[PDB]
């Protein structure tokens, strides 16, 4: 017997188009999404060119409309030059992304004053999300309070971070957060297997105590989001490995495994991959859209999943229980048992919908 | 310039049919909902007969399908006899309502052991909501923990209650809650004007400190819900006044007034009248459904609103800013400037939808 889920939403993916299409493109990355039970993705702006102004957003919008197989929204990225320039296009984006630490991006902001300027100029009713690690979480929360608005923290990975967010929520501060599967299911213990190149990710893998703190504080986690960050094996295994893991095809199977073990409920999963993404990012429903999963199917993650061009995975060898059987998107069969059945371009920009 | 909102959801209404139809019926109560910008309502089970078994639910379902003008879900009610008997129909209901204090209902449970029995037998993935005042909030939270499941607290009205819920959320306990407009906008200060009959409501009106504590702790409030509880003026003004206020037609205008004063944002309103109702009660989207409001229109609440058969209101004389201009429900104009334009029976049981 299958179980039917609503269309799941991943609010943090890297689809690499424009400019990195050997790693992934809209067509391959959204095929990976559908195979992972994801029918809507929010794509990060750290592409080449980066999505930091109106002409780059327009280009990316057309590339996504032509290549995407599931529906999508595109983030804008904050830069050191573009505060106060995004107002006419802000509503067409998923939100504004701030890169506040070193990672795979050229968009790091060098002064908290630049963060303040973005918080003051971006429309106050639209989302701001931040790459903000360790003390940077506290710093960006301070900027949010000074400008009296909300903030969403991307890929929370550490005990320190989740406890800070917990303390802020207890004081009634408007903060939400997401956690990525690798920070729930991998730790320092896995770095020997992965090696130093494959193991490169930001935030870095945490200790067992970090992983246990995230699970213990599940009530504080508003969303799961993959931070699907594909790079080729050649890049991961080379002399200057970029940080990031592919994850669209493995996120839901890993989480279903945890559900099967009683670590969280199916409702907990649906709040974090459907309802809270909708409400934090104001994302629309998808009509006649659902995901059919088999909760009982046991399998072992192989050395690469079928669709991502990354052609590797850090979860190789993990035993999982649960699999995606069929996805229907807006009344068309989009995926069945390893075959994607909607073409590049089927997907639509959800921010253009009524 | 108007503003377009999604279809708002009221998870706590009394539509009085069957058995109290001089107070309200499905047709009049859903007309009141639409005029208040509400396109989906969850109707409480304290009718005559009360909705405490399968035959009563079947009757109510057909009466609602024939009379409702907006969409709906029907609660089941817990009784001293029906624990362990509702499993086949539980999924067809909005949830299970527990009456744990004295109020307008014959369904009070007389032993916490009966509460435990319901928490143990009702399907653990479906909603339980409770009328639970003062220490009863703590008691029902204890029962929820002992049975390791969630609970939703209806019409939170007191500083004591919101602070208890806040403490439980800080410990990661799965509790949500709602607040009704009269406990945000009326207090002991209004009892002289209302008088002792009209002023009868459960929970009773609080002190100014109770009202201020609810506002100060808005981050703890998951939903707004009217507890629309219509009774005629003759009943309210007579020798044994029943408790309750009508409220569908005044809820959104009162809350829009607060938005206009900066007391909360429009997003705060949409989380509490749309997104969190959806996610707590697993309620489906409504296609081609929206509510158009004028945020600038100033008016004074009259001695009765047009649609509720209660034909009175405790908010008479309050100045408000904001009004519902037009409602579209599933592609049909349902309401425009004081005229309902969909007939009794247009509304549907959302739990029968895919
Ligand atoms: N997380 C990573 O390690 N890499 C991400 C960037 C990011 O999310 O910081 C990427 O785009 O490769
Ligand atoms: N709240 C009230 O004062 N009355 C409600 C019952 C309830 O919500 O307890 C009613 O049904 O009249
Ligand atoms: Zn397209
Ligand atoms: Zn990041
Ligand atoms: Zn993110
Ligand atoms: Zn990222
Ligand atoms: Zn929204
Ligand atoms: Zn009908
Ligand atoms: Zn009640
Ligand atoms: Zn309620
Ligand atoms: Zn009630
Ligand atoms: Zn749901």
Q: In words, what does this structure look like?
A:
Two copies of one chain form a homodimer. Chain A is an alpha/beta fold. Chain A has one domain (3-352): TIM Barrel. Chain A is built from eleven helices and 14 strands. In chain A, the strands form three sheets. A six-stranded parallel β-sheet of chain A has the order 5-6-7-8-9-10. In chain A, strands 1-11-12-13-14 form a five-stranded antiparallel β-sheet, with helices on one face. A three-stranded parallel β-sheet of chain A has the order 2-3-4. In chain A, a hairpin with a 2-residue loop joins strand 12 and strand 13. In chain A, helix 3 packs across helix 4. The longest helix of chain A has 16 residues, at 266-281. The radius of gyration of chain A is 19 Å and the shape is globular. One zinc ion is lined by residues 12, 129, 154-155, 178, 225 of chain B. One N-carbamoyl-L-aspartate (NCD) binds next to loops of chain A. It is classed as hydrolase. Keywords: CAD disease, multienzymatic protein, zinc, carboxylated lysine, hydrolase. The assembly is dimeric. Mutant R1810Q of the dihydroorotase domain of human CAD protein bound to the substrates.
């Amino acid at each position: 017997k299958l179980v039917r889920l609503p269309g799941l939403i991943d609010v943090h993916v890297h689809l690499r188009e424009p400019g990195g299409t050997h790693k992934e493109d809209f067509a391959s990355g959204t095929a990976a999404a559908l195979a992972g039970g994801i029918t809507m993705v929010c794509a990060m702006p750290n592409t080449r060119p980066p999505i930091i102004d109106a002409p780059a957003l327009a280009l990316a919008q057309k590339l996504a409309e032509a290549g995407a197989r599931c529906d999508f929204a595109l983030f804008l990225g904050a830069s050191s030059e573009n505060a106060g320039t995004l107002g006419t296009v802000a509503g067409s984006a998923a939100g504004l992304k701030l890169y506040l630490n070193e990672t795979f991006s050229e968009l790091r902001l060098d002064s908290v004053v630049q963060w303040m300027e973005h918080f003051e100029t971006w429309p106050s009713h639209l989302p701001i999300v931040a790459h903000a690690e360790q003390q940077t979480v506290a710093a960006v929360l301070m900027v949010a309070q000074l400008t009296q608005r909300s903030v969403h923290i991307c890929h929370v990975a550490r005990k320190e971070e989740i406890l800070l967010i917990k303390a802020a929520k207890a004081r009634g501060l408007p903060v939400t957060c997401e956690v990525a599967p690798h920070h729930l299911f991998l730790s320092h213990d896995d770095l020997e297997r992965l090696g130093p190149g494959k193991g490169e990710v930001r935030p870095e893998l945490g200790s067992r105590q970090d992983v246990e703190a995230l699970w213990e504080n599940m009530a504080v986690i508003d969303c799961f989001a993959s931070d699907h960050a594909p790079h080729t094996l050649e890049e991961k295994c080379g002399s200057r490995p970029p940080p990031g893991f592919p994850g669209l095809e493995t996120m839901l199977p890993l989480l279903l495994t945890a559900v099967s073990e009683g670590r969280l409920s199916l409702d907990d999963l649906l709040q974090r991959l459907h309802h809270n993404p909708r409400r934090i990012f104001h994302l629309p429903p998808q009509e006649d859209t659902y995901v059919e999963v088999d909760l009982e199917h046991e399998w072992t993650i192989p050395s690469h999943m079928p669709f991502s061009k990354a052609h590797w995975t850090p979860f190789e060898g993990q035993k999982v229980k649960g699999t995606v059987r069929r996805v229907v998107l807006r009344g068309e069969v989009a995926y069945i048992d390893g075959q994607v059945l909607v073409p590049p371009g089927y997907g639509q920009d959800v921010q253009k919908w009524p």
